[PDB]
Write a protein that binds this ligand. Structure first.
Ligand SMILES: CC(C)(C)NC(=O)[C@@H]1CN(Cc2cccnc2)CCN1C[C@@H](O)C[C@@H](Cc1ccccc1)C(=O)N[C@H]1c2ccccc2C[C@H]1O
Lengths: 99, 99
Protein backbone atom coordinates (compact mmCIF):
# COMPACT_ATOMS: atom_id res chain seq x y z
CA UNK A 1 0.00 0.00 0.00
CA UNK A 2 0.92 3.70 -0.15
CA UNK A 3 2.81 5.75 2.39
CA UNK A 4 2.77 9.49 1.80
CA UNK A 5 5.65 10.99 3.73
CA UNK A 6 3.91 13.72 5.72
CA UNK A 7 4.56 11.63 8.80
CA UNK A 8 7.50 9.28 9.45
CA UNK A 9 7.08 5.91 7.66
CA UNK A 10 7.12 3.97 10.93
CA UNK A 11 5.38 0.60 11.34
CA UNK A 12 5.21 -2.15 13.94
CA UNK A 13 7.54 -4.98 13.00
CA UNK A 14 8.02 -8.38 14.62
CA UNK A 15 11.67 -9.58 14.86
CA UNK A 16 9.71 -12.28 15.60
CA UNK A 17 8.27 -12.79 18.94
CA UNK A 18 9.30 -9.21 19.45
CA UNK A 19 7.24 -6.26 18.13
CA UNK A 20 9.55 -3.31 17.39
CA UNK A 21 8.50 -0.01 15.75
CA UNK A 22 10.57 0.76 12.62
CA UNK A 23 11.34 3.63 10.23
CA UNK A 24 11.21 2.61 6.54
CA UNK A 25 14.37 4.29 5.28
CA UNK A 26 15.38 4.54 1.60
CA UNK A 27 18.58 6.35 2.59
CA UNK A 28 19.86 3.52 4.79
CA UNK A 29 21.78 0.75 3.02
CA UNK A 30 21.41 -1.56 5.99
CA UNK A 31 19.02 -2.05 8.97
CA UNK A 32 19.75 -1.22 12.61
CA UNK A 33 17.44 -2.08 15.53
CA UNK A 34 18.15 -0.99 19.13
CA UNK A 35 16.94 -2.51 22.35
CA UNK A 36 17.28 -6.14 21.24
CA UNK A 37 19.61 -9.08 22.02
CA UNK A 38 19.32 -11.47 19.18
CA UNK A 39 21.32 -14.66 18.70
CA UNK A 40 24.46 -16.77 18.72
CA UNK A 41 26.70 -15.46 15.98
CA UNK A 42 27.13 -11.82 15.01
CA UNK A 43 29.99 -10.07 13.28
CA UNK A 44 31.48 -6.82 14.46
CA UNK A 45 30.35 -4.08 12.11
CA UNK A 46 30.98 -0.36 11.84
CA UNK A 47 28.32 1.92 10.28
CA UNK A 48 28.70 5.45 8.99
CA UNK A 49 25.87 7.96 9.30
CA UNK A 50 25.67 11.75 9.58
CA UNK A 51 27.94 13.06 12.30
CA UNK A 52 30.11 10.01 12.88
CA UNK A 53 30.30 6.18 13.14
CA UNK A 54 28.62 3.53 15.27
CA UNK A 55 29.64 0.01 16.30
CA UNK A 56 26.89 -2.52 15.63
CA UNK A 57 26.64 -6.33 15.70
CA UNK A 58 25.46 -8.24 12.61
CA UNK A 59 22.85 -11.00 12.74
CA UNK A 60 22.06 -12.68 9.44
CA UNK A 61 18.98 -14.69 8.48
CA UNK A 62 16.39 -13.41 11.01
CA UNK A 63 12.63 -13.95 11.31
CA UNK A 64 10.97 -10.68 10.33
CA UNK A 65 7.24 -10.32 9.80
CA UNK A 66 6.32 -6.84 8.62
CA UNK A 67 3.58 -5.49 6.34
CA UNK A 68 1.93 -8.93 6.42
CA UNK A 69 4.92 -10.31 4.59
CA UNK A 70 7.45 -12.59 6.24
CA UNK A 71 11.15 -12.20 5.44
CA UNK A 72 14.38 -13.71 6.71
CA UNK A 73 16.75 -10.74 6.85
CA UNK A 74 20.13 -9.46 7.91
CA UNK A 75 19.65 -6.91 10.73
CA UNK A 76 22.29 -5.17 12.87
CA UNK A 77 21.96 -4.42 16.56
CA UNK A 78 23.43 -1.07 17.60
CA UNK A 79 22.83 1.94 19.82
CA UNK A 80 20.58 3.67 17.33
CA UNK A 81 18.22 6.57 18.35
CA UNK A 82 15.53 5.10 16.06
CA UNK A 83 15.00 1.63 14.55
CA UNK A 84 15.60 1.55 10.80
CA UNK A 85 14.53 -0.83 8.10
CA UNK A 86 16.96 -0.01 5.31
CA UNK A 87 17.26 -0.94 1.66
CA UNK A 88 18.38 -4.51 2.37
CA UNK A 89 14.93 -5.27 3.75
CA UNK A 90 12.91 -2.80 1.67
CA UNK A 91 13.95 -4.61 -1.54
CA UNK A 92 13.12 -7.98 0.00
CA UNK A 93 9.67 -6.60 0.70
CA UNK A 94 9.30 -5.23 -2.84
CA UNK A 95 8.67 -1.62 -1.80
CA UNK A 96 9.38 1.28 -4.15
CA UNK A 97 9.50 5.07 -4.25
CA UNK A 98 7.12 6.59 -6.82
CA UNK A 99 6.87 9.86 -8.66
CA UNK B 1 9.36 8.29 -11.25
CA UNK B 2 9.31 4.73 -9.86
CA UNK B 3 12.53 3.91 -8.07
CA UNK B 4 13.27 0.29 -7.21
CA UNK B 5 15.42 0.29 -4.14
CA UNK B 6 18.03 -2.13 -5.51
CA UNK B 7 20.53 0.70 -5.77
CA UNK B 8 20.66 4.00 -3.82
CA UNK B 9 17.84 6.19 -5.20
CA UNK B 10 19.95 9.08 -6.47
CA UNK B 11 18.67 11.68 -8.91
CA UNK B 12 20.03 14.99 -10.20
CA UNK B 13 18.25 17.97 -8.65
CA UNK B 14 18.72 21.67 -9.52
CA UNK B 15 18.99 23.89 -6.49
CA UNK B 16 18.40 27.49 -7.60
CA UNK B 17 19.60 26.42 -11.06
CA UNK B 18 22.62 24.42 -9.79
CA UNK B 19 22.73 20.69 -10.55
CA UNK B 20 23.49 18.42 -7.60
CA UNK B 21 23.16 14.66 -7.04
CA UNK B 22 20.86 13.90 -4.14
CA UNK B 23 19.78 10.72 -2.39
CA UNK B 24 16.00 10.50 -1.98
CA UNK B 25 15.72 9.56 1.66
CA UNK B 26 12.44 8.63 3.40
CA UNK B 27 14.15 8.34 6.75
CA UNK B 28 15.40 11.95 6.74
CA UNK B 29 12.97 14.44 8.32
CA UNK B 30 14.91 17.27 6.66
CA UNK B 31 17.28 18.00 3.77
CA UNK B 32 21.00 18.80 3.83
CA UNK B 33 23.48 19.29 0.94
CA UNK B 34 27.18 20.06 0.72
CA UNK B 35 29.20 21.82 -1.92
CA UNK B 36 26.77 24.65 -2.64
CA UNK B 37 26.84 28.23 -1.25
CA UNK B 38 23.40 29.70 -0.77
CA UNK B 39 24.16 33.01 0.91
CA UNK B 40 24.30 34.91 4.13
CA UNK B 41 20.61 34.77 4.92
CA UNK B 42 20.62 31.59 6.96
CA UNK B 43 19.93 30.52 10.54
CA UNK B 44 22.33 28.21 12.37
CA UNK B 45 20.67 24.88 13.13
CA UNK B 46 21.90 21.69 14.80
CA UNK B 47 20.88 18.36 13.29
CA UNK B 48 21.20 14.79 14.60
CA UNK B 49 22.08 11.89 12.37
CA UNK B 50 22.84 8.32 13.32
CA UNK B 51 26.48 9.11 14.19
CA UNK B 52 25.80 12.24 16.25
CA UNK B 53 25.16 15.96 16.03
CA UNK B 54 26.38 18.47 13.39
CA UNK B 55 26.10 22.22 12.76
CA UNK B 56 24.23 23.36 9.61
CA UNK B 57 23.02 26.54 7.86
CA UNK B 58 19.30 26.82 7.33
CA UNK B 59 17.74 28.57 4.30
CA UNK B 60 14.02 28.92 3.71
CA UNK B 61 12.09 28.81 0.42
CA UNK B 62 14.91 27.77 -1.81
CA UNK B 63 13.89 26.79 -5.35
CA UNK B 64 14.34 23.06 -6.15
CA UNK B 65 13.65 21.31 -9.47
CA UNK B 66 13.50 17.51 -9.63
CA UNK B 67 12.17 15.52 -12.62
CA UNK B 68 9.91 18.23 -14.11
CA UNK B 69 8.69 19.62 -10.74
CA UNK B 70 9.75 23.01 -9.33
CA UNK B 71 9.25 23.50 -5.60
CA UNK B 72 10.41 25.86 -2.83
CA UNK B 73 11.62 24.21 0.34
CA UNK B 74 13.80 24.57 3.38
CA UNK B 75 17.29 23.18 2.84
CA UNK B 76 20.30 23.01 5.13
CA UNK B 77 23.88 23.21 3.88
CA UNK B 78 26.80 21.57 5.68
CA UNK B 79 29.46 18.91 5.76
CA UNK B 80 27.74 15.75 4.64
CA UNK B 81 29.25 12.59 2.96
CA UNK B 82 26.18 12.49 0.67
CA UNK B 83 23.44 15.01 -0.32
CA UNK B 84 20.03 14.22 1.10
CA UNK B 85 16.47 15.04 0.07
CA UNK B 86 14.37 14.30 3.15
CA UNK B 87 10.64 14.18 3.81
CA UNK B 88 10.13 17.98 3.71
CA UNK B 89 10.96 17.82 0.00
CA UNK B 90 9.69 14.32 -0.90
CA UNK B 91 6.27 15.44 0.25
CA UNK B 92 6.53 18.75 -1.71
CA UNK B 93 7.30 16.53 -4.68
CA UNK B 94 4.25 14.32 -4.10
CA UNK B 95 6.42 11.23 -3.70
CA UNK B 96 5.23 8.12 -1.81
CA UNK B 97 6.43 4.68 -0.64
CA UNK B 98 4.95 1.69 -2.59
CA UNK B 99 4.05 -1.87 -1.63
C1 LIG C 1 18.28 15.20 8.44
C2 LIG C 1 19.32 14.06 8.63
C3 LIG C 1 19.72 13.91 7.14
C4 LIG C 1 20.56 14.52 9.57
N1 LIG C 1 18.66 12.77 9.19
C5 LIG C 1 19.30 11.65 9.51
O1 LIG C 1 20.52 11.50 9.39
C6 LIG C 1 18.46 10.52 10.10
C7 LIG C 1 18.77 10.42 11.60
N2 LIG C 1 18.16 9.32 12.36
C8 LIG C 1 18.27 9.36 13.84
C9 LIG C 1 17.95 10.64 14.72
C10 LIG C 1 18.89 11.06 15.66
C11 LIG C 1 18.61 12.12 16.53
C12 LIG C 1 17.39 12.76 16.47
N3 LIG C 1 16.37 12.41 15.55
C13 LIG C 1 16.73 11.30 14.67
C14 LIG C 1 18.41 8.03 11.68
C15 LIG C 1 18.11 8.04 10.16
N4 LIG C 1 18.63 9.23 9.42
C16 LIG C 1 18.38 9.23 7.99
C17 LIG C 1 19.39 8.37 7.23
O2 LIG C 1 18.79 7.88 6.02
C18 LIG C 1 20.68 9.05 6.79
C19 LIG C 1 21.61 8.23 5.90
C20 LIG C 1 22.58 9.29 5.37
C21 LIG C 1 23.80 8.71 4.73
C22 LIG C 1 23.71 7.88 3.62
C23 LIG C 1 24.84 7.20 3.18
C24 LIG C 1 26.06 7.36 3.85
C25 LIG C 1 26.15 8.20 4.95
C26 LIG C 1 25.02 8.88 5.39
C27 LIG C 1 22.34 7.13 6.69
O3 LIG C 1 22.47 7.20 7.91
N5 LIG C 1 22.84 6.12 5.97
C28 LIG C 1 23.64 5.04 6.54
C29 LIG C 1 22.91 4.05 7.48
C30 LIG C 1 21.94 4.16 8.47
C31 LIG C 1 21.40 3.02 9.10
C32 LIG C 1 21.81 1.72 8.77
C33 LIG C 1 22.79 1.48 7.81
C34 LIG C 1 23.34 2.58 7.16
C35 LIG C 1 24.34 2.75 6.05
C36 LIG C 1 24.24 4.13 5.44
O4 LIG C 1 23.58 4.33 4.19
Amino acid sequence: PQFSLWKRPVVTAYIEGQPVEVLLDTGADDSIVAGIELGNNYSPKIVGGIGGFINTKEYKNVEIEVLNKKVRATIMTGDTPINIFGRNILTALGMSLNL
